Design an enzyme around this catalytic site. Structure first.
Site, short mmCIF file in Angstrom:
data_model
loop_
_atom_site.label_atom_id
_atom_site.label_comp_id
_atom_site.label_asym_id
_atom_site.label_seq_id
_atom_site.Cartn_x
_atom_site.Cartn_y
_atom_site.Cartn_z
N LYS A 5 0.31 -1.23 -0.10
CA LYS A 5 -0.28 0.19 -0.63
C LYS A 5 0.75 1.73 0.01
CE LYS A 5 -3.62 -2.45 2.38
NZ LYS A 5 -4.42 -2.88 1.38
N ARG A 16 -8.22 21.91 22.17
CA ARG A 16 -7.14 21.38 22.83
C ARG A 16 -6.76 22.95 23.73
NH1 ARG A 16 -4.38 17.14 22.97
NH2 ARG A 16 -2.40 18.04 23.60
N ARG A 31 4.12 15.40 29.88
CA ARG A 31 5.42 15.53 29.25
C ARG A 31 5.66 16.78 27.66
NH1 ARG A 31 1.36 12.16 27.38
NH2 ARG A 31 1.27 12.82 25.27
N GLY A 52 -4.46 17.90 25.82
CA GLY A 52 -6.61 18.07 25.50
C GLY A 52 -7.58 17.81 26.25
N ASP A 53 -6.68 17.27 27.83
CA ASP A 53 -7.49 17.80 29.14
C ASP A 53 -6.46 17.84 30.35
OD1 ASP A 53 -6.23 15.28 29.41
OD2 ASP A 53 -7.61 14.26 29.26
N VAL A 54 -7.18 17.74 31.67
CA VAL A 54 -6.08 18.11 32.27
C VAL A 54 -5.82 17.01 33.65
CG1 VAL A 54 -4.80 19.85 34.70
CG2 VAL A 54 -6.39 20.55 32.67
N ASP A 114 -9.04 15.65 34.45
CA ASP A 114 -9.59 13.95 34.99
C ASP A 114 -8.64 14.61 36.35
OD1 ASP A 114 -8.92 12.89 31.86
OD2 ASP A 114 -10.74 13.41 32.79
NA NA Z 1 -4.39 14.32 29.17
#
Ligand code: NA
Ligand code: NA
Ligand code: NA
Length: 326
Positions: A63, A137, A171, A177-179, A241
């Site tokens: 491919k 984000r 990182r 995207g979130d905390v 989260d």
């Molecule tokens: Na995250």
DNA sequence: GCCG
DNA sequence: CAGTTCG
DNA sequence: CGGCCGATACTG
């Protein structure tokens, strides 16, 4: 770094297609072929130059060839028309491939249809309500404000509490995207049943706007997934989260929560090859598994005071958060 | 899909 | 339980 | 042939 975006662009489309239709293993296959091609350096130019690459087989190579020759992949022109809709539906928090396929089978084709005719779970209704926000984000600086907000409300009732933002934030990514907030206590017990107090403190100040996952009627709550929004104008709802862990599981919890997801998976797959097991709770040795590799014997937990210990115990050189995107 |  | 979610 | 992370932690 992307020296093959011409190909790891047509493949991603195919990968997400398989993913939303529920062919998870085939999608995982493509994800790795792509997760590798990008990490390359030189633009693949030969069928043999492809196979040589780990994560790429004869089928993928083929491919890859058609693209570096036809500039197109005949497969992409036979993708079901349902895919874009499945993707649209699947991006609703709380709805996965099974719910997306069902809604589609029932004749639904747009969020409008879902809003007015679909039967939604409490989580999905929350997901739909913040559909655009959950796809955006946030600058890491805002993540900092959110972590600080949680930490402040947490240390407000116990200054011993250790609070750390993990995930993409730790990182070192520019946007998140979130905390992901990890909370633990150095003594080893003061972290018990704090959710009640923290969540209430945050709800009190109207910081939390919606709860997605919060088993509060049970004092054994380990995690919280919700929606929050900083005060002032121009603020968007953000995913939050929070996990509360016993100090003894701190390292493993931090490693887990820091990710990346594919990084965790690779590391855990590695532990399994060595007769060990890694989870957000602990790193175990002498684990007993059956023919299908299922954990049928707990083995014993190894002392892992710090992330470095986990890498060490697995015979791996340490890695800073920033070097864990894969 | 890849790989052992 | 199946589904979905977290990293 | 058959695993691909975790005896995910929740939801209903
Ligand atoms: Na995250
Ligand atoms: Na979803
Ligand atoms: Na609840």
């Amino acid at each position: 770094t992307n020296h093959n975006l011409h190909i790891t662009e047509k493949l991603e489309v195919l990968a997400k297609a398989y993913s939303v239709q529920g062919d998870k293993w085939r999608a995982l296959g493509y994800a790795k072929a792509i997760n590798a091609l990008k990490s390359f350096h030189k633009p693949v130019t030969s069928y043999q130059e492809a196979c040589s690459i780990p994560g790429i087989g004869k089928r993928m190579a083929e491919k890859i060839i058609e693209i570096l020759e036809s500039g197109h992949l005949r497969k992409l022109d036979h993708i079901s028309e349902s895919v874009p809709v499945l993707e649209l539906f699947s991006n609703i928090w709380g709805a996965g491939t099974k719910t997306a396929q069902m809604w589609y089978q029932q004749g639904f084709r747009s969020l409008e249809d879902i809003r007015s005719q679909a039967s939604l779970t409490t989580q999905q209704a929350i997901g739909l309500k913040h559909y655009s926000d959950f796809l955006e984000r946030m600058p890491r600086e805002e993540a900092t404000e959110i972590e600080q907000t949680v930490q402040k409300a947490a240390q407000a009732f116990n200054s011993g509490l250790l609070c750390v933002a993990c995930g993409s934030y730790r990182r070192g990514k520019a946007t998140c995207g979130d905390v992901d907030v990890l909370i633990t206590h150095p003594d080893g017990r003061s972290h018990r049943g704090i959710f009640s107090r923290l969540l209430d403190s945050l709800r009190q100040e109207g910081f939390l706007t919606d709860d997605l996952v919060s088993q509060e009627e049970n004092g054994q709550q380990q995690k919280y997934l919700g929606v929050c929004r900083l005060p002032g104008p121009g603020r968007r709802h953000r995913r939050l989260d929070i996990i509360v862990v016993p100090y003894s599981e701190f390292a493993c919890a931090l490693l887990y929560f820091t990710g990346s997801a594919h990084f965790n998976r690779s590391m855990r797959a590695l532990a399994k090859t060595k007769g060990m097991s890694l989870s957000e709770h602990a790193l175990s040795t002498a684990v007993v598994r059956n023919t299908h590799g299922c954990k049928v014997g707990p083995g014993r937990v190894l002392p892992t005071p710090t992330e470095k210990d986990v890498f060490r115990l697995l015979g791996l050189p340490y890695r800073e958060p920033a070097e864990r995107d894969w």
